[PDB]
A = this chain, B = another copy of it.
Amino acid sequence: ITPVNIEEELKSSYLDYAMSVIVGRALPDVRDGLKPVHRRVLYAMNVLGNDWNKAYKKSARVVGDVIGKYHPHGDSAVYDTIVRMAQPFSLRYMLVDGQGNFGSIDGDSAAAMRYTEIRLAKIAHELMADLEKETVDFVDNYDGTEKIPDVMPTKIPNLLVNGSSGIAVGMATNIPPHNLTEVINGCLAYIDDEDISIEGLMEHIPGPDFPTAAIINGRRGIEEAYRTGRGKVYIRARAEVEVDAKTGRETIIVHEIPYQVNKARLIEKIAELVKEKRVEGISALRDESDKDGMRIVIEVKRDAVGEVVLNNLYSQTQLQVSFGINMVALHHGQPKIMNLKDIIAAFVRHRREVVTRRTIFELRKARDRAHILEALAVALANIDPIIELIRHAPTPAEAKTALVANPWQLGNVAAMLERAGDDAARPEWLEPEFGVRDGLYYLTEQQAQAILDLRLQKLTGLEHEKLLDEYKELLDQIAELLRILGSADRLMEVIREELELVREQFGDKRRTEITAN
């Protein structure tokens, strides 16, 4: 029985729990804006083939795959974060299509897992673009035998167009949504000039944009949050007072409500405030929403003034709320408070890494294919001795070793092989012993097996010209990738075209109006 102290048992146990919640549960990354829960759900939907132009699929399959293969943490929490991606009043740009009963703005809950069907949205395919070209890193599971990506190679700037809301041990985050066509313009303005100030970057991005419209009342709290990281804004509902043509009766019509505000609780609170005799001048209260939009009707008494009753409801009911901005995110594995310029500059660096990691993979694949096609094109000009050497061999192993024993003469392909000069198509691992020396060709063990697997229908006069055209196309594609890797202004020229294409395909309009006090 070895004794321990209570001071070191408490310190060792509490730090193991606190570091796991910060890094592995909450506080999303700054490069893709996703928590570890969301990444595994999107990857499991990507593996199954649940595309946007195919048929719908039941959510029970997706939840079962996520639980059984990637995420061992519970069952009801996985279904709760799926329905947050499908509600139009919850996210600015939705990531799951969804069909069925997914709740309401009055507080209705969603249906069970057996009755709802989901599939990926079209904007969610831009987050997993070029995943199978070795652009990100992969990690293991809890029991091995499966691989999960460490980060996503996104093309769309998340953590700004959507937000974040999480509680950790010692810290928490709160980020509002924005508009896509403004943040893309800010990203292009950073590319054109890297010394852009906060004031020069704020003429493209004026403020936050919410999916429920309404009005932002004031500009002082927005400029403080973009310079420091912390600030406070006010959100106000949209309403008006109208009079009757014949009588002098007045009514109040409410068209929009603030962010994260329930409607039934608001109506119940207004009715309770009338019943307790704290707001005077209200005689009736209904709810006629229909399908054209939102409409709440409040009746005003004849002896009261409709402007004073409307001004009293702003400071007593939940028709004006407050939002506290606090931006923390994981940067190089540790939490950090960031301003607007740090988030923009951490996206272009990720784009640079993704493009320069895709180019090397494409170049290596092209050079391997050209190396195979050279030996395929050589052997079709020496058909009769190849067939004689194969037929005079007892076993295919001795036939394979007889092919590399002697050099093979060229003919009708020397003009093709001289065009690929300056060793631009040779693989990097190839020894200098093999290849084209003098007027003869030297084969390898890999090239000799490709001749023995050649089909008998390749001897026709049609596919040889197809092989020559494929060789020509491979040489052009090899030249362009080297021109991209040669310089840096060409690399920055590739990045701008993708951003303009994203802005063209997924453009939108501003819903929230920003005024002064």
Q: Which residues of A contact B (CB under 8 A)?
A: 58, 60-61, 63-65, 67-69, 72, 114, 383, 387, 390-391, 393-396, 399, 451-457, 459-462
Contacts and interface: CB of A to CB of B under 8 A. Distances in A.
For A64, A72, A461, the residue with the greatest tally of chain B CB atoms inside 10 Å of its CB is: A64
Contacts of A387: 387, 459
A457 B391 CA distance: 9
B459 A390 contact: yes
A390 B457 contact: yes
B456 A390 contact: yes
Contacts of A61: 64, 68-69
Contacts of A395: 460, 462
B72 A114 contact: yes
For A454, A456, A461, the residue with the greatest tally of chain B CB atoms inside 10 Å of its CB is: A456
A446 B452 CA distance: 24
B64 A461 contact: no
Given A61-B69, A64-B67, 15 more contacts: A60-B64, A60-B68, A387-B459, A390-B457, A391-B459, A393-B460, A393-B461, A394-B460, A394-B462, A395-B462, A396-B457, A451-B456, A453-B455, A453-B456, A455-B456
Contacts of A459: 387, 390-391
A459 to B, nearest CB: 5
26 contacts: A58-B68, A60-B67, A61-B64, A64-B65, A64-B67, A65-B68, A387-B387, A387-B459, A390-B456, A390-B457, A390-B459, A390-B460, A391-B459, A391-B460, A394-B460, A394-B461, A394-B462, A395-B460, A396-B462, A452-B456, A453-B455, A453-B456, A453-B457, A454-B455, A454-B456, A456-B456
A460 B64 contact: no
A459 B454 CA distance: 12
A401 B485 CA distance: 50
Nearest to A114: B72
A516 B114 CA distance: 55
A396 B64 contact: no
A51 to B, nearest CB: 16
Contacts of A383: 391
A457 B72 contact: no
A452 B463 CA distance: 14
A351 to B, nearest CB: 37
For A63, A65, A395, A460, the residue with the greatest tally of chain B CB atoms inside 10 Å of its CB is: A460
Nearest to A449: B457
A60 B63 CA distance: 11
